Coordinates of C-alpha atoms and ligand atoms in Angstrom, one line a residue:
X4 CA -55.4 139.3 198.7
X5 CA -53.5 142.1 197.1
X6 CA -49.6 143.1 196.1
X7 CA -48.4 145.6 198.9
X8 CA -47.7 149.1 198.0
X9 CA -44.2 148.9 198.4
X10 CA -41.5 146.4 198.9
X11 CA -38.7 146.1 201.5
X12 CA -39.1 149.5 202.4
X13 CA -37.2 150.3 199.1
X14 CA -39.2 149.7 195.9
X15 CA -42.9 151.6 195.4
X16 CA -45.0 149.6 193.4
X17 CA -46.9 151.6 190.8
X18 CA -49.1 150.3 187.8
X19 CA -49.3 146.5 186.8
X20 CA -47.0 145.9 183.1
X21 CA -48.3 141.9 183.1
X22 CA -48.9 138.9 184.4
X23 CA -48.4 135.3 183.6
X24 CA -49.3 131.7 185.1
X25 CA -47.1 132.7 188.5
X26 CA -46.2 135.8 188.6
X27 CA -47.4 139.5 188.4
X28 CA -44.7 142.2 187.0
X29 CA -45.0 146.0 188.2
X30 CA -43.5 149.0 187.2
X31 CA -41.7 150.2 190.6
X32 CA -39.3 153.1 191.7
X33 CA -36.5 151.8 193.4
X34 CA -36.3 154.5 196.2
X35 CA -32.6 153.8 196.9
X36 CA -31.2 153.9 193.5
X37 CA -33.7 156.3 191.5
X38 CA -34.2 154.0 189.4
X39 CA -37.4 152.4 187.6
X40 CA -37.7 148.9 187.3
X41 CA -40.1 145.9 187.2
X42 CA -40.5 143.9 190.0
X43 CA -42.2 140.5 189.1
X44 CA -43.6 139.6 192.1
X45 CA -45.4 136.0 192.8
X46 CA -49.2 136.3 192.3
X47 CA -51.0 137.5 195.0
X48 CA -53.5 134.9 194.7
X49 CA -51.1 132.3 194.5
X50 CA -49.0 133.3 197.2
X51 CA -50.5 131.0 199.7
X52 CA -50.4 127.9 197.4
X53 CA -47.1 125.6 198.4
X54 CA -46.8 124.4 195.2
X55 CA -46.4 128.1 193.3
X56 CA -44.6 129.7 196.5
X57 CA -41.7 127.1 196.0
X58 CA -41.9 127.0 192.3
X59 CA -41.3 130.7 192.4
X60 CA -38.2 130.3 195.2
X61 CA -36.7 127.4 192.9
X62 CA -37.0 130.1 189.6
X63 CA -35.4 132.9 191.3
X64 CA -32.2 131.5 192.4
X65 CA -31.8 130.7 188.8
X66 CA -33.0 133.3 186.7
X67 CA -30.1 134.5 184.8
X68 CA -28.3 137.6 185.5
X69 CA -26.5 139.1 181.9
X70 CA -25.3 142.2 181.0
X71 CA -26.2 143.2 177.5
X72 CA -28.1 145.7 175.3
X73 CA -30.8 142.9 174.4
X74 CA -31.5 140.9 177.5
X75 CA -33.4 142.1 180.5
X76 CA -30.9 142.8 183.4
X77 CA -31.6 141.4 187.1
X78 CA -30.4 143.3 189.6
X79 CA -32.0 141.7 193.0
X80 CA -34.0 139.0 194.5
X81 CA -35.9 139.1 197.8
X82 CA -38.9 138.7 199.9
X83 CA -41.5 140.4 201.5
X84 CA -43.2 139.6 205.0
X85 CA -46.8 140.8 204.2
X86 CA -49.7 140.1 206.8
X87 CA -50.9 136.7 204.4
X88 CA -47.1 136.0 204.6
X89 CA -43.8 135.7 202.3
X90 CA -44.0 137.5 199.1
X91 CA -40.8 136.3 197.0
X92 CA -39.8 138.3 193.9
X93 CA -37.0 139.2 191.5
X94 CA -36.4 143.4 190.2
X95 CA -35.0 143.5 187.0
X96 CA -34.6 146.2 183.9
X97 CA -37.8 148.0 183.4
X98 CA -39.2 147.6 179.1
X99 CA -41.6 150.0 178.6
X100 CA -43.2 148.2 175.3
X101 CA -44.8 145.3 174.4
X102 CA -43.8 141.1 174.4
X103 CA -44.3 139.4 171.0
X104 CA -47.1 137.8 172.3
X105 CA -49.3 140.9 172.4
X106 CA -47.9 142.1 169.3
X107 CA -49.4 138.9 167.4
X108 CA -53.0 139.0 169.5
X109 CA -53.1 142.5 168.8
X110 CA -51.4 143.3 165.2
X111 CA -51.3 139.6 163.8
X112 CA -48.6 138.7 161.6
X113 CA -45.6 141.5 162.0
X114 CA -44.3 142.3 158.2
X115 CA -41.3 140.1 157.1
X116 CA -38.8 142.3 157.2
X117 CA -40.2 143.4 160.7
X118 CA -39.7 139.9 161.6
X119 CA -36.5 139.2 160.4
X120 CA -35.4 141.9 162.3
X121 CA -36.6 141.2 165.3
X122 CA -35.5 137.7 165.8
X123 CA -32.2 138.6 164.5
X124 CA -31.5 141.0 167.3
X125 CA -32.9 138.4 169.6
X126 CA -30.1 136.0 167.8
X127 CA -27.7 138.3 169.2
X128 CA -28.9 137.8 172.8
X129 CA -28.8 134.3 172.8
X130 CA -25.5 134.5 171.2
X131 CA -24.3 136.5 174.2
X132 CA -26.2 134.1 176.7
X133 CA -24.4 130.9 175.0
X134 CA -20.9 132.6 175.2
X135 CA -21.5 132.7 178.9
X136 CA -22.9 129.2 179.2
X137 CA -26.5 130.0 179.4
X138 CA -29.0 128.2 177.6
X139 CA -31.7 130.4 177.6
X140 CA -34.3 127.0 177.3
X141 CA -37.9 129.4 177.6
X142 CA -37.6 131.4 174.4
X143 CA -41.4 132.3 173.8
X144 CA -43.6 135.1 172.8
X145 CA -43.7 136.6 176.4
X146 CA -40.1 136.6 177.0
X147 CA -39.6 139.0 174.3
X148 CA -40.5 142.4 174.2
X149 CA -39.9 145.8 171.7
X150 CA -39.6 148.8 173.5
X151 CA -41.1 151.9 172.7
X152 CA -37.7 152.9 171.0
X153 CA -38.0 149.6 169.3
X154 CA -35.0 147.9 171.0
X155 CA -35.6 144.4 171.1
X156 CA -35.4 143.0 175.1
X157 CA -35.0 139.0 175.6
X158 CA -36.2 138.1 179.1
X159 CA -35.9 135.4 182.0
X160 CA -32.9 132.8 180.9
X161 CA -31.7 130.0 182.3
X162 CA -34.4 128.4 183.8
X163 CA -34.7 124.8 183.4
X183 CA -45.4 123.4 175.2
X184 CA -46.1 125.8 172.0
X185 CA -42.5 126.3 172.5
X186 CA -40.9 123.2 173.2
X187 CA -38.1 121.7 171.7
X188 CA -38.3 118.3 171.0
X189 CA -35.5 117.3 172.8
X190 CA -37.3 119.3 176.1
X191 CA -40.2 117.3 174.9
X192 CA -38.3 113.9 175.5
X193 CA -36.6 114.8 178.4
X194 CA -33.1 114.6 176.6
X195 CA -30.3 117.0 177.5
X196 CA -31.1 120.8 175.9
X197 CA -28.2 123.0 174.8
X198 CA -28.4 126.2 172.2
X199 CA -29.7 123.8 169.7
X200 CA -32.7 124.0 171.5
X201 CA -32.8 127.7 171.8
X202 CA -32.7 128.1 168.1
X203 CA -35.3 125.3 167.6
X204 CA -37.9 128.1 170.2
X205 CA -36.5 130.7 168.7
X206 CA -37.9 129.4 165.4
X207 CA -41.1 128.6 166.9
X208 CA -41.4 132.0 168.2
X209 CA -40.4 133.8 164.2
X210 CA -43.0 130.9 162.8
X211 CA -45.8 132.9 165.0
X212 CA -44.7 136.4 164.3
X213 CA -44.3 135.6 160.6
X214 CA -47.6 133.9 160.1
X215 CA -49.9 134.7 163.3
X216 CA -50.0 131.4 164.5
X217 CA -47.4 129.1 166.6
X218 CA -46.8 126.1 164.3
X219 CA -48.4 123.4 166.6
X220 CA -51.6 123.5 167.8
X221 CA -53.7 120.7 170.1
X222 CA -56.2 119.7 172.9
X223 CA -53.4 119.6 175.0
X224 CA -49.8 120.6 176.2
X225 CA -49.0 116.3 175.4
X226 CA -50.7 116.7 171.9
X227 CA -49.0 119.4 171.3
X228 CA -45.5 118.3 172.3
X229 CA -46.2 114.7 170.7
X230 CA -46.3 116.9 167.5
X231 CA -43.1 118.6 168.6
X232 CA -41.6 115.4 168.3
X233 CA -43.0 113.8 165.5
X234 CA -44.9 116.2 162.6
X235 CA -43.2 118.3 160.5
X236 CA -44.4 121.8 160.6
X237 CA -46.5 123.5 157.6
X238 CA -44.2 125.7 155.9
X239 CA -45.3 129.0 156.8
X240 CA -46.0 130.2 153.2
X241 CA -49.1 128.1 153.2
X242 CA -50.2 129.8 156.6
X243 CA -50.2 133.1 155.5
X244 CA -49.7 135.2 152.2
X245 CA -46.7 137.6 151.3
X246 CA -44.3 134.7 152.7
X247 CA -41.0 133.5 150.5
X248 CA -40.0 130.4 149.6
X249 CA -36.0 131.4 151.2
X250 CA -38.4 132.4 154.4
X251 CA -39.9 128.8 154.8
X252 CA -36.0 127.7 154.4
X253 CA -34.4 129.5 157.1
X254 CA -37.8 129.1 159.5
X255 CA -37.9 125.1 158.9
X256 CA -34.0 124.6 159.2
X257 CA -34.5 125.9 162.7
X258 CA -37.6 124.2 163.2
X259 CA -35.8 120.4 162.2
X260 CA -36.4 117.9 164.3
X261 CA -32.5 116.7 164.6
X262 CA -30.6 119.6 166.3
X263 CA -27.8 118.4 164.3
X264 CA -29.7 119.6 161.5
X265 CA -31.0 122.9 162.5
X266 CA -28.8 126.1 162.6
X267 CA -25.8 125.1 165.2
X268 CA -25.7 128.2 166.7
X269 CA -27.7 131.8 167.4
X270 CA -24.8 133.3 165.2
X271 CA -25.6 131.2 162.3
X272 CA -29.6 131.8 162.3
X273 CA -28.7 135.4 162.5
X274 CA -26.4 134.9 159.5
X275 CA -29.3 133.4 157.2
X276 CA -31.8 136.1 158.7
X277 CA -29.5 139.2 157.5
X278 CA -29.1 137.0 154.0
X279 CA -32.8 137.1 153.6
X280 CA -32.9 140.4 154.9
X281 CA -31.0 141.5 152.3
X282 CA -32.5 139.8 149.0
X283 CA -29.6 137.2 149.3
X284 CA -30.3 133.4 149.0
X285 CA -30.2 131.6 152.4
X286 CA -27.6 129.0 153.2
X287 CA -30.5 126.6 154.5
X288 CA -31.8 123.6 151.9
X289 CA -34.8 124.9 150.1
X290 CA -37.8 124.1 150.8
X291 CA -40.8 123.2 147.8
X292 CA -44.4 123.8 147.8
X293 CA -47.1 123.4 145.4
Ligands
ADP1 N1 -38.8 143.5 182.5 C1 -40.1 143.7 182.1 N2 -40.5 144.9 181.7 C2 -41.8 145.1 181.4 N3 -42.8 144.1 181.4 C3 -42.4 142.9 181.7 C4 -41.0 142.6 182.1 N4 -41.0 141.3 182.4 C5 -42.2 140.7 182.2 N5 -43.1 141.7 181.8 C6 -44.5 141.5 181.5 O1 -45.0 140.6 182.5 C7 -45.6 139.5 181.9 C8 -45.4 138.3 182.8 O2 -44.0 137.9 182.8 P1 -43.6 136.4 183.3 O3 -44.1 136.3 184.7 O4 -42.2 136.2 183.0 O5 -44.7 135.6 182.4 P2 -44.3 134.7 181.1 O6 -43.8 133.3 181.7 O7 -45.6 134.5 180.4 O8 -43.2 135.3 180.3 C9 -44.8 139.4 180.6 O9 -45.5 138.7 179.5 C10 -44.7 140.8 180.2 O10 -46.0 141.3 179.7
MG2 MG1 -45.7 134.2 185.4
MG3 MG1 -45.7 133.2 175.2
MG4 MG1 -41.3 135.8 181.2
MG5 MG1 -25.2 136.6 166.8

């Protein structure tokens, strides 16, 4: 079982960009528009499966459409009838770059500053999302990518466990709180190479979501500053009322540190 060479007669598939635990994502031209653009496409060898097939139809209808600089645009959802059958998929903004998540396999640890920089422009995407009553609630290392210009590009919002927030963990209701709380799971990882929980399994590793507090990530890696593990474990607290309330206001404490200016979050003491 393969992808098809082309899509409703309108999109030409071209080289493979990724893949993840449903879907498959290839560059395409859109022979209509003249466009480029990625069409993630449900895995061909998951196509068949009932389970992933209606998984995939579920995400689709909700994967959020924005229009700004630093979020991944979706312009169309469809489906294919192949000769195995249905082929669902979703054509949004082409990236050519990399997610996070190869950056860190492949480069480790991004420099500070590097960091700071790139979380703070994804602050500014989730801000946008929020405005428009989007939670984003899958802010990971995969979903953000740096072009080859090096814009930063936040991907697939709005669909309802390295990642986690606690309150996902628990099954309580998720708001931006929770996006912040991911989004300073995701700056732990490029700061110090590694997420801050780690287990056996997605429960162990949600259990610790919940209940242990994270190592600060100056004592995972060198060249880290104390106002660093500030602004990293505010948004990592376990109470959302005690985290950063909003994207805007972990941005704020990013450009402080940024800068050489002390952050606004309670210090943190090692040692
Ligand atoms: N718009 C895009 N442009 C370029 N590459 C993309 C795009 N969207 C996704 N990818 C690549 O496809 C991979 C799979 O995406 P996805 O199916 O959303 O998996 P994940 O859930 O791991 O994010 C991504 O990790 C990334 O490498
Ligand atoms: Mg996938
Ligand atoms: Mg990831
Ligand atoms: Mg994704
Ligand atoms: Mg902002």
């Amino acid at each position: 079982m393969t992808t098809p060479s082309h899509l409703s007669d309108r999109y030409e598939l071209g080289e493979i960009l990724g893949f993840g635990g449903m879907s498959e994502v290839h560059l395409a031209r859109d022979l209509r528009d003249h466009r480029d653009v990625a069409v993630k496409v449900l895995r061909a060898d998951l196509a068949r499966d009932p389970s992933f097939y209606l998984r995939f139809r579920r995400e689709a209808q909700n994967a959020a459409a924005l229009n700004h600089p630093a979020i991944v645009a979706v312009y169309d959802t469809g489906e294919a009838e192949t000769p195995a059958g249905p082929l669902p998929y979703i054509v949004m903004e082409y990236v050519d770059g990399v997610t996070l998540r190869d950056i860190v396999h492949t480069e480790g640890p991004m420099t500070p500053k590097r960091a700071i920089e790139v979380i703070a422009d994804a602050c500014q995407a989730l801000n946008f999302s929020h405005q428009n009553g989007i939670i984003h609630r899958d802010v990971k290392p995969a979903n953000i990518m740096i072009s080859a210009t090096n814009a930063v590009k936040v991907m697939d919002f709005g669909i309802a466990a390295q990642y986690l927030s606690p309150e996902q963990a628990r099954g309580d209701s998720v708001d931006a709180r929770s996006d912040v709380y991911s989004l300073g799971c995701v700056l732990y990882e490029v700061l110090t190479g590694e997420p801050p929980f780690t287990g056996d399994s997605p429960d162990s590793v949600a259990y610790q979501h919940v209940r242990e507090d994270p190592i600060p990530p100056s004592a995972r890696h060198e060249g880290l500053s104390a106002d660093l593990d500030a602004v990293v474990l505010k948004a990592l607290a376990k109470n959302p009322e005690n985290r950063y309330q909003t994207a805007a206001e972990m941005r704020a404490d990013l450009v402080r540190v940024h800068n050489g200016e002390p952050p606004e979050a309670p210090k943190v003491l090692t040692d």
